[PDB]
């Protein structure tokens, strides 16, 4: 009845999409070849006789990562034409993704997205998975978002993006790409959910007792978060919430649309036996700084809006009591202009566990989405990195050679300054 | 005889309507296949009030189910008693309001209101003489709030001489289920003040409180709250369906309870309510019924009547009882608590007795109170609205759908005026 | 030879009429189906062969109460068309009964009354049973009284009305209806026999030792009072009194026509065995304030006219002795302008007892009708209630919407003030 | 999909190219006949990057061998894996450069450059999407230096949008193998600063030092130095040929490592490197690899990184590893040695991880460093050039071929400008 389209861009987006689609196939009992021995309609199409194809688009400017998908276990799951690949990557360059290489491919992906949307009767919106520090995941994501805003318009668009860590970075030119893509995608997004690799590393090390986490573990956790978000669309519960409610509840002002995600309970099978994972305990754990998925201090900011999504054996009265207990706590503070700052959703389906996974099976799960002013600190840090790097004009010629102008750098810096000023003004 | 049209809007409205129809079908001896299977002919004498005879001794409820998303419609259709509803009465959209009042009232509601009004008009033309309409919805949502408001306005335009009842749940004082609740609640109250004859205010926190302390329920569910609400709805309209000693229909209650047209917000209540263990330790009599009724713990609205004064009170009794005891007890409670009753209205209490009690219970009673303590709830909603509107938070979501700031100002002014009147007559 | 027509309006009137007709059928030996295995002619017509139909009209603006009759045990007794029902009730609103809903039905009831009167050769008058605080029982009876006075004229009209109690009342807007119906029916009635629910509750509690009286007991007692009144028409005695004699004896001035009724002896079977229920004892009991059917104090007023109707084994000499003994008592005072204040009626038929009833079988019975100035206190209390409500204009819009004007309220208040002034003037 | 063209110039270039092709053929499971004999299909999935399929499941390298004497060409033809090379790709002259830059760049190289350019053009036209070119040569000779310079200039004229990588052996500080080394080195650097994208500086003294202290090799041989260089070359382009978690091709490395176009001279390194006896006394983990990488003794350029500051650092990891440990340890080494990292570039380190480790080893890593210590080598070469040019020693040999003193002055000035820039950003 109501359908949702998922787009995965770049290496990180494609791999997180692999994890998410594995999780969905496990949830709905669909085998990797598309056969199963009907709320899954929102995420899976039906073609012919007993074949289910995902409503997904996988885009990358280099063929390796998507060639892995076309060769791996889920080769028969995806339709051949929705796995679009280029020949040359963007090489961590925003300008290459935006102008030089992005322009040669975006028409095909737009055609495929239109073809997918033609088969939908109640399309709710889009989810795009990408990175901030990448080349294609920055430039092509910005170009695609602007084209989607021009084409579709009112339909909601939600981002899942990997926020660069404060001290743990892979690239050297990450601040340039992050600032440019934020400036370009500010006006064409409805809300963006933020995660950080360093925070997930710390969570795996502490709660899951894992010495050597890899990217697969992080992708599994991100897939669990996304499944918790979309369970309202893929199942039926006591109190449901679809895509538009997230946008209308978590965004107070059009430019302030960067909430961060949190999941609980994340524990191994060893510690799960000695714990009673009640609603109050997980609700409390969702609000501790050590459990959040973005490395930042919620204590140094004030919450604006909070969204709690419960799964499994949950009854509303304990939810009400837990939220009241949270409200009476002084350690965490809400802005004075938001007397009502909670959105509550309850679902009946408990969270499933992937075989060979790192999480233990549980009766309950909470996905908390919080809009807080503490993101201003991360924005200021990224802006400082950009200023330090741009003072000496380092790596600027790489961007200029691909079609970018230094005026774009200046405009992006000005827009970021305006954004942090807006955050500071809202805080008071 | 006298016919009532039922409308359900939004998720909460649809759920409460489903529970209410299950309870009603239990009362009248109808299985979920539409056939009559009761024993007493009293269940069939006045069955035309709620049901339609559709050939082959099958009965279809006279209800219209309305929503902007197909989810709740599918959930209600697939659940128990989902077969009795007429397939043509399911009017649903594809987009959904997304907890936005402007979407429900101006964008999507404007699209679906013509179809829902067509269905309502057909149903009302079918019946020989209709008493009025009743609607179940919520003030914190976007579909229920705006859509029920628009439907109420359109119906009152079409049928100005009939009775308009609403059973709307209101935002709670302690915990909110939506960030933008005050906006929707304020606008909905602004419209309901003009376009409704009597409104019953239900609070989720009060229902949780009742289920916890009184019913001793360890893990209450939304089904239990809907059960209590449905019990109240059934208790309100008992005199139209069963014989009794002193009969009071909807218009009698309306004439008795609302002295001034803007003061028509009530707090319902039900008795008896006992746990499983404590059932043995009391005897079913009228005194315990009036003790349970006149008690802040049993109130279904999150307002304590002892901070205000009662304007009028309705006590609708069911079962075989003595009128002398009822009148004596109402006189006694009025005399003992004279400080809580308005002094310029003698005999604040209106009484009605029906012979047929609810199935399972020997005796029952439904309490309707029109107190001035509702000003506390209205004041809290107004103050939250003002705090939000000072900084224009979340305002662009409503403004992008055609809403103007003057609408918000008018709604705030109406809320303030209503609170001022309630304080004035106190 | 001489016939009487009974009209029952509203819920209370219809139920009291049910009790009265049950009592009449019991007294005259008529089965509930109208067959009997000839003074009853005054109350039962003869149609075809061995079928006796009552001379009654049953009216209500809602169908449920008369539907109970049409499906009850006395279904075969009444002529079906004489049971007239409306579609929507008056909802305790005098204006709805008088203007909005009354005009749609009164023509039919007038036609039926005319048809009933055409079968009478010696029609004595009308007995109408109604309430004061009701909607239809106020408005429709006022309109009907106007139409009857216009049509028939000189034929006497007697009301049996339920007065609102000083402290025990059901509706909230009863004073409005009572004042309006009094103002409307002052000029069209000949006399009204008046009762109160609270007084009957007290009498049932005290004399009959009934813990939980219901409406059935009150209706049975009222039916006994009416049967005692009409025994002179339905039987033959030593000294009989007809309908016109009540009017010419109990009404000294045209506006002062509100006598109140009293019945004696009312006792259970337990106390009847230890008592000699002589004429003097019951005559004395009729005058005690604890035994009257209206909650009021005769000790604070002065009697103007008194009528005593004896039934059963009663001889005139003891009646004369008891009346003399009453006259010598100083605690009960008569107005100085009425030297002769007693009307005496003696009948031979003892009072019958309904099986399963609460009254015991007795040899003698007295129904005492008294016109006393003490009703001015109740009138003043009702006027005070009306003034208190009308000061704030509460509930006025309900009446105005149905076709009433505030000038009617002012006129009713003025007329009631004039009436209480007249009572206070005749008191001196 | 991405294609690389290989060129070998001079004796040293030909020898290292032969060793590199041996190592690559071992990696991809190809015997010296050209047929495929591996097991994993991953060896064949991206085989087109280096090899051409020439019917009958036989593969020929996409390499061009260039020299001005038939000696080294005959030696590489008659040696192991000499048969896999295409016979038409051997372009050789008869005279020879005589360790003279002018002969290589103006007299004989001008004659042979047309044929070598024809071969390169044919090979580049054959491939559908070429990533770029890599050249192996030496800066101390006359054939390698001048001819690689001329070929680089001509290719950059023809293909300005592709990547040009060079693995050039630079003169060592302690002992020189040629009397006229500074002239050729200075002119070659003057051309390389302009016509290349990234240069990897190799020092024979550093390779001898590594083979002595680290590998415990009693009698090192040029084959072993070529083995180490080939290991570095194969480690650079692993992400183009095998799947991994974080992929980084040549353009990614270029974007991450060179901030200003003239600062593209790196010092490569490899790990792990241990002797036969000492293999048992250590565990292969990421801390050990990054300890070996960040160490002056493990660098293949005869420069001390502690005498300057790192601009950028690239680490390419091969094998099954945890990204958490890699990122943690790179952050830790950046924090511990903050004094050796440029302050105005945060996060100097770029990391890439490939799944397939080299045959025989479970874990391996290749280190590329862009440090300011290369100014020491450039300063030494420029100083020797100035000392020789002051007395006009051996100048008539270069002048008789048609070169002018102005070219020498321009090259010396360019070297001074380069060292001045490196000191400025230091
Ligand atoms: N959580 C998570 N993050 C990833 C993963 N893969 C890459 N990333 C992040 O992506 C950032 C760099 O962007 P990439 O995705 O690698 O590159 P890209 O977006 O494809 O853009 P190109 O450079 O053109 O290839 C790194 O800093 C990583 O933190 C992954 O599998 N899981
Ligand atoms: N004694 C006695 N009084 C009754 C009975 N039924 C109703 N009443 C009185 O009637 C008063 C209200 O008027 P109703 O008779 O109930 O209503 P109505 O006359 O039918 O007028 P509507 O409101 O239009 O239906 C109450 O205050 C009762 O005291 C009865 O059975 N016996
Ligand atoms: N009593 C009761 N309340 C409900 C139920 N479902 C939702 N609600 C209330 O309705 C509010 C949410 O509004 P909702 O109906 O979901 O928005 P809508 O879809 O626009 O009509 C919350 O504050 C809940 O407390 C239910 O089943 N029972
Ligand atoms: N690593 C390595 N270096 C070499 C090899 N052969 C020669 N060289 C170096 O190259 C320099 C000689 O230059 P050469 O290539 O022979 O001159 P060309 O004939 O003009 O190219 C000497 O300084 C050697 O250190 C070799 O096989 N391996
Ligand atoms: Mg990539
Ligand atoms: Mg009635």
* Coil vs helix vs strand at A127: strand
DSSP label at residue C424:
H
d(Cα C302, Cα B393) in Å, to the nearest integer? 76
Question: Are residue A159 and residue A34 in the same domain, yes or no?
Answer: yes
Nearest CA to D106 among D72, D162, D68?
D68
Q: Chain B residues with CB inside 8 Å of C91's CB?
A: 249, 251-252, 254-255
How far CA C20 is from CA of A355, C219, C229, C325, D62, in Å, comes to 84, 8, 12, 34, 122
Q: Does A324 touch chain B (CB under 8 A)?
A: yes
Domain end marker among B236, B259, B282? B259
Please, what's the b/e burial string for B221-244 (b: 16 or more CB within 10 A of its CB; e: otherwise)?
ebebbbbbbbbbbbbbbbbbbbbb
Neighbours of ion ligand 6 (CB under 5 A): C 11, 89
Question: Are residue B99 and residue B10 in the same domain, yes or no?
Answer: yes
Nearest CA to B127 among B209, B52, B218?
B52
Paired strand residues for C346: C239, C310
Query: In the sheet that B90-92 helps form, which strands lie side by side, from edge to edge?
Result: B90-92, B63-67, B3-9, B130-138, B163-170, B198-203, B265-271, B363-371, B310-319, B349-354
Question: Are residue A197 and residue A265 in the same domain, yes or no?
Answer: no
User: Which range marks the domain in which residue B417 is found?
Assistant: 374-426
How far CA A286 is from CA of A241, A264, A292, in Å, comes to 19, 6, 7
Question: Are residue D363 and residue D419 in the same domain, yes or no?
Answer: no
In the block, which residue shows the tokens 């039919």? C108
Q: Which value, in Å, is the radius of gyration of the alpha carbons in chain B?
A: 21
Residue A173 to residue D344, Cβ atoms within 8 A: no
- Distance between D255 CA and the closest CA of chain A, angstroms: 7
* Coil vs helix vs strand at B315: strand
Question: Are residue C251 and residue C184 in the same domain, yes or no?
Answer: yes
Residue D259 to residue A68, Cβ atoms within 8 A: no
Question: Are residue A223 and residue A289 in the same domain, yes or no?
Answer: no
Query: In the sheet that A125-131 helps form, which strands lie side by side, from edge to edge?
Result: A83-85, A56-60, A4-9, A125-131, A156-163, A191-196, A260-264, A364-372, A303-312, A342-347
Domain end marker among A374, A394, A413? A374
Nearest CA to B154 among B64, B42, B55?
B64
Question: Are residue D212 and residue D319 in the same domain, yes or no?
Answer: no
How far CA C1 is from CA of C38, C42, C44, C153, in Å, comes to 10, 7, 12, 20
Q: Which value, in Å, is the radius of gyration of the alpha carbons in chain A?
A: 21
| Ligand 3: residue whose CA is nearest its atom 6 | B12
In the residue annotation, C245 being an active-site residue is answered as yes
Question: Are residue A321 and residue A252 in the same domain, yes or no?
Answer: no
Q: Is the CB of C137 under 6 A from ligand 2?
A: yes
* Coil vs helix vs strand at A369: strand
Q: Is the CB of C54 under 6 A from ligand 2?
A: no
For residue A306, what is the enclosing H or E element? strand A303-312
Question: Are residue D396 and residue D281 in the same domain, yes or no?
Answer: no
Question: Are residue A346 and residue A389 in the same domain, yes or no?
Answer: no
Q: Which CATH number characterizes residue A89's domain?
A: 3.40.50.1440
* Coil vs helix vs strand at D75: helix
Question: Are residue B347 and residue B413 in the same domain, yes or no?
Answer: no
Residue B11 to residue A249, Cβ atoms within 8 A: no
For residue D353, what is the enclosing H or E element? strand D349-354
Hey, which bits of A234-299 come out as E strands?
260-264
D-contacting residues of A 392-421, CB under 8 Å?
392, 394-395, 397-398
Query: Of the listed A245, A281, A377, A420, which one is catalytic?
Result: A245
Question: Are residue B82 and residue B205 in the same domain, yes or no?
Answer: yes
Is the Cβ–Cβ distance between A302 and A373 less than 8 Å? yes
Q: Does residue D272 have a cis bond before it (omega within 30 degrees)?
A: yes
Paired strand residues for A264: A366
d(Cα B197, Cα B193) in Å, to the nearest integer? 9
Instruction: Quote the Cα angle for B360-B362-B367, to 5°.
Output: 100
Ligand 1 pocket test: which of A7, A8, A9, A11 has the largest number of ligand atoms within 8 Å of its C-beta? A11
Please report the atom of ligand 4 found closest to the CA of residue D72. 19
Q: Chain B residues with CB inside 8 Å of C135's CB?
A: 252
Helix spans in A96-162 (H): 106-118, 136-151
Q: Which CATH number characterizes residue C392's domain?
A: 1.10.287.600
Instruction: Quote the Cα angle for D43-D45-D49, to 5°.
Output: 90
- CA atoms in the 13 A half-sphere facing the CB of D218: 1
Residue B170 φ/ψ, nearest 5 degrees: -115, 155
Q: Chain B residues with CB inside 8 Å of A371's CB?
A: none
Is the Cβ–Cβ distance between A376 and A420 less than 8 Å? yes
Q: Pick left, alpha or beta for residue A403 (phi over 0 → left; psi -120 to 50 → alpha; otherwise beta).
A: left
Which of B259, B312, B313, B328 to mutate against chain C (most C CBs within 10 Å)?
B259
| Tokens at A314, concatenated | 């949950």
Question: Are residue D344 and residue D382 in the same domain, yes or no?
Answer: no
Please tell me which residue of chain B has the smallest CA distance to A427: B391
- CA atoms in the 13 A half-sphere facing the CB of D52: 19
Q: Which CATH number characterizes residue A283's domain?
A: 3.30.1330.20
Is the Cβ–Cβ distance between D344 and A389 less than 8 Å? yes
Burial class, B347, CB count within 10 angstroms (exposed 0-12 / middle 13-18 / buried 19+): buried
Question: Are residue C6 and residue C52 in the same domain, yes or no?
Answer: yes
Q: Which CATH number characterizes residue B288's domain?
A: 3.30.1330.20
Q: Which CATH number characterizes residue B38's domain?
A: 3.40.50.1440
Burial class, D303, CB count within 10 angstroms (exposed 0-12 / middle 13-18 / buried 19+): buried
d(Cα C145, Cα C12) in Å, to the nearest integer? 18
Q: Is the CB of B68 under 6 A from ligand 3?
A: no
d(Cα A156, Cα B415) in Å, to the nearest integer? 33
Q: Provide the domain count of chain B.
A: 3
Is the Cβ–Cβ distance between D258 and D22 less than 8 Å? no
Q: Which CATH number characterizes residue D420's domain?
A: 1.10.287.600
User: How large is the angle between the packed helices D323-336 and A197-206, nearest 10 degrees?
Assistant: 110
Hey, which bits of C207-328 come out as E strands?
260-264, 303-312
Q: Name the maximum alpha-carbon separation found in chain B.
A: 62
Hey, which bits of A265-302 come out as E strands?
none
Q: Does residue D87 have a cis bond before it (omega within 30 degrees)?
A: no
Nearest CA to B251 among C97, C143, C103?
C97
Residues 6+ apart with CB under 8 A from A139: A90, A93, A94, A95, A96, A97, A98, A99, A102, A177, A180, A181
| Ligand 2: residue whose CA is nearest its atom 8 | C12
Q: Is the CB of C101 under 6 A from ligand 2?
A: no
Q: Pick left, alpha or beta for residue D11 (phi over 0 → left; psi -120 to 50 → alpha; otherwise beta).
A: alpha
Question: Are residue D214 and residue D264 in the same domain, yes or no?
Answer: no
B neighbours by CB contacts (3+ pairs under 8 Å) = A, C
d(Cα A12, Cα D125) in Å, to the nearest integer? 34
Q: Does C167 touch chain B (CB under 8 A)?
A: yes
Ligand 1 pocket test: which of A131, A174, A214, A217 has the largest number of ligand atoms within 8 Å of its C-beta? A131
Burial class, B281, CB count within 10 angstroms (exposed 0-12 / middle 13-18 / buried 19+): exposed
Resolution to 1 decimal place, in Å: 3.1
Residue B209 φ/ψ, nearest 5 degrees: -60, -45
Q: How far is the CA of A171 from the centre of ligand 5 (A)?
A: 12
Is the Cβ–Cβ distance between D152 and D191 less than 8 Å? yes
For residue A159, what is the enclosing H or E element? strand A156-163
Is the Cβ–Cβ distance between A249 and B179 less than 8 Å? yes
d(Cα A332, Cα A288) in Å, to the nearest integer? 9
d(Cα A353, Cα A403) in Å, to the nearest integer? 47
Is the Cβ–Cβ distance between A208 and A359 less than 8 Å? yes
* Coil vs helix vs strand at C155: coil
Question: Are residue C335 and residue C255 in the same domain, yes or no?
Answer: no
Domain end marker among A259, A286, A302? A259
Q: Provide the domain count of chain A.
A: 3
Residue B339 φ/ψ, nearest 5 degrees: -70, -20
Question: Are residue D83 and residue D199 in the same domain, yes or no?
Answer: yes
Q: Chain D residues with CB inside 8 Å of A87's CB?
A: 1-2, 129
Residue B179 to residue A324, Cβ atoms within 8 A: no
Is the Cβ–Cβ distance between D364 and D273 less than 8 Å? no
Question: Are residue A310 and residue A387 in the same domain, yes or no?
Answer: no
* Coil vs helix vs strand at B235: helix
User: Which range marks the domain in which residue A411 is found?
Assistant: 375-428
Q: Pick left, alpha or beta for residue B124 (phi over 0 → left; psi -120 to 50 → alpha; otherwise beta).
A: alpha
For residue B380, what is the enclosing H or E element? helix B374-390
Please tell me which residue of chain D has the smallest CA distance to A87: D1
Question: Are residue C140 and residue C250 in the same domain, yes or no?
Answer: yes
Please, what's the b/e burial string for A267-306 (b: 16 or more CB within 10 A of its CB; e: otherwise)?
beeeeeeeeebebeebbbbbbeeebbbbbbebeebbbbbb
Is the Cβ–Cβ distance between C220 and C21 less than 8 Å? no
Question: Are residue C12 and residue C130 in the same domain, yes or no?
Answer: yes
- Distance between A9 CA and the closest CA of chain D, angstroms: 15
Ligand 4 pocket test: which of D22, D140, D201 has the largest number of ligand atoms within 8 Å of its C-beta? D140
Domain end marker among A244, A259, A274? A259
For β-strands B363-371 and B310-319, DSSP reports them as: antiparallel
| Tokens at A298, concatenated | 């919620």
Question: Are residue B49 and residue B123 in the same domain, yes or no?
Answer: yes
Question: Are residue D89 and residue D9 in the same domain, yes or no?
Answer: yes
Question: Are residue A381 and residue A370 in the same domain, yes or no?
Answer: no
Burial class, D321, CB count within 10 angstroms (exposed 0-12 / middle 13-18 / buried 19+): buried
């Amino acid at each position: 009845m109501r359908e949702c389209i998922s787009i995965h861009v770049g290496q990180a987006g494609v791999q997180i999409g692999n994890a998410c689609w594995e999780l969905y196939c496990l949830e709905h009992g669909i085998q990797p070849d598309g056969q199963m021995p009907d709320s899954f309609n929102t995420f899976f199409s039906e073609t012919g006789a007993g074949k289910h194809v995902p409503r997904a688009v996988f885009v990358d400017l280099e063929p390796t990562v998507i060639d892995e998908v076309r060769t791996g276990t889920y080769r028969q799951l995806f339709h051949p034409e929705q796995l679009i690949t280029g020949k040359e990557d963007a090489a961590n360059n925003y300008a290459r993704g935006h102008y030089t290489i992005g322009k040669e491919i975006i028409d095909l992906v737009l055609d495929r997205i239109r073809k997918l949307a033609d088969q939908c009767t109640g399309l709710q919106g889009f989810l795009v998975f990408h990175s901030f520090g990448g080349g294609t995941g920055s430039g092509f994501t910005s170009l695609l978002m602007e084209r989607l805003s021009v084409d579709y318009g009112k339909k909601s668009k939600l981002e899942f993006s990997i926020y660069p860590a404060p001290q743990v970075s892979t690239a050297v030119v990450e601040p340039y790409n992050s600032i440019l893509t934020t400036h370009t995608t500010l006006e064409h997004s409805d809300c963006a959910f933020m995660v950080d690799n360093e925070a997930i590393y710390d969570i795996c090390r502490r709660n899951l007792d894992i010495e050597r986490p890899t990217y697969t573990n992080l992708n599994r956790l991100i897939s669990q978060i996304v499944s918790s978000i979309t369970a309202s669309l893929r199942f039926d519960g006591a109190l449901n919430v679809d895509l538009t409610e997230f946008q209308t509840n978590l965004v107070p002002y059009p430019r302030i649309h960067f909430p961060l995600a949190t999941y609980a309970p994340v524990i191994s099978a060893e510690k799960a036996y000695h714990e009673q994972l009640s609603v109050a305990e997980i609700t409390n754990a969702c609000f501790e700084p050590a459990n959040q998925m973005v490395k930042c201090d919620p204590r140094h900011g004030k919450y604006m809006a909070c969204c709690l999504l419960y799964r499994g054996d949950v009854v509303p009265k304990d939810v009400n009591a837990a939220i009241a207990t949270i409200k009476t706590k002084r350690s965490i503070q809400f802005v004075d202009w938001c007397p009502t700052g909670f959105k509550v959703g309850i679902n009946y389906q408990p969270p499933t566990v992937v075989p060979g996974g790192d999480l233990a099976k549980v009766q309950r799960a909470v996905c908390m989405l919080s809009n807080t002013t503490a993101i201003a600190e991360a924005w200021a840090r990224l802006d400082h990195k950009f200023d330090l790097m741009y003072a000496k004009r380092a790596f600027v010629h790489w961007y200029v050679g691909e079609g970018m102008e230094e005026g774009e750098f200046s405009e992006a810096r000005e827009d970021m300054a305006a954004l942090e000023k807006d955050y500071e003004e809202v805080g008071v | 005889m006298r016919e009532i049209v039922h409308i359900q809007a939004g998720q909460c409205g649809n759920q409460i309507g489903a529970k209410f129809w299950e309870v009603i079908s239990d009362e009248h001896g109808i299985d979920p296949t539409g056939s009559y299977h009761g024993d007493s002919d009293l269940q069939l004498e006045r069955i035309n009030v709620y049901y339609n005879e559709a050939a082959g001794n099958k009965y279809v409820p006279r209800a219209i189910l309305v929503d902007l998303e197909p989810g709740t419609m599918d959930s209600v259709r697939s659940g128990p008693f989902g077969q009795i509803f007429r397939p043509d009465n399911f009017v649903f959209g594809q987009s959904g309001a997304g907890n936005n009042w402007a979407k429900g009232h101006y964008t999507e509601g404007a699209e679906l209101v013509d179809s829902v009004l067509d269905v309502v008009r057909k149903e009302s033309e079918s019946c020989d003489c209709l008493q009025g309409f009743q609607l179940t919805h919520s003030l914190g949502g976007g579909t229920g709030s705006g859509m029920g408001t628009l439907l109420i306005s359109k119906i009152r335009e079409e049928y100005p001489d009939r009775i308009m009842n609403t059973f709307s749940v209101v935002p709670s004082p302690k915990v909110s289920d939506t960030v933008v609740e005050p906006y929707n609640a304020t606008l909905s109250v602004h419209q309901l003040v003009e376009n409704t004859d009597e409104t019953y205010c239900i609070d989720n926190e009060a229902l949780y409180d009742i289920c916890f302390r009184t019913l001793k329920l360890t893990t209450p569910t939304y089904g239990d709250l809907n059960h209590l609400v449905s019990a109240t709805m059934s208790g309100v309209t008992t005199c139209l369906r069963f014989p009794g000693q002193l009969n009071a229909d909807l218009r009698k209650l309306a004439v008795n309870m609302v002295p001034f047209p803007r003061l028509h917000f009530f707090m319902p209540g039900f008795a008896p309510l006992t746990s499983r263990g404590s059932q043995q330790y009391r005897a079913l009599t009228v005194p315990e019924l009036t003790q349970q009724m006149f008690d802040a713990k049993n109130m279904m609205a999150a307002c304590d009547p002892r901070h205000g004064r009662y304007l009028t009170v309705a006590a609708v009794f069911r079962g075989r009882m003595s009128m002398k005891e009822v009148d004596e007890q109402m006189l006694n409670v009025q005399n003992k608590n004279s400080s809580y009753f308005v002094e310029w209205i003698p005999n604040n209490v209106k009484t009605a007795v029906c012979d047929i009690p609810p199935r399972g219970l020997k005796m029952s009673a439904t309490f309707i109170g029109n107190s001035t303590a509702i000003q506390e709830l209205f004041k809290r909603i107004s103050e939250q609205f003002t705090a939000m509107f000072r900084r224009k938070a979340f305002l662009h979501w409503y403004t992008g759908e055609g809403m103007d700031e003057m609408e918000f100002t008018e709604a705030e002014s109406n809320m303030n005026d209503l609170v001022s009147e309630y304080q004035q007559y106190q």
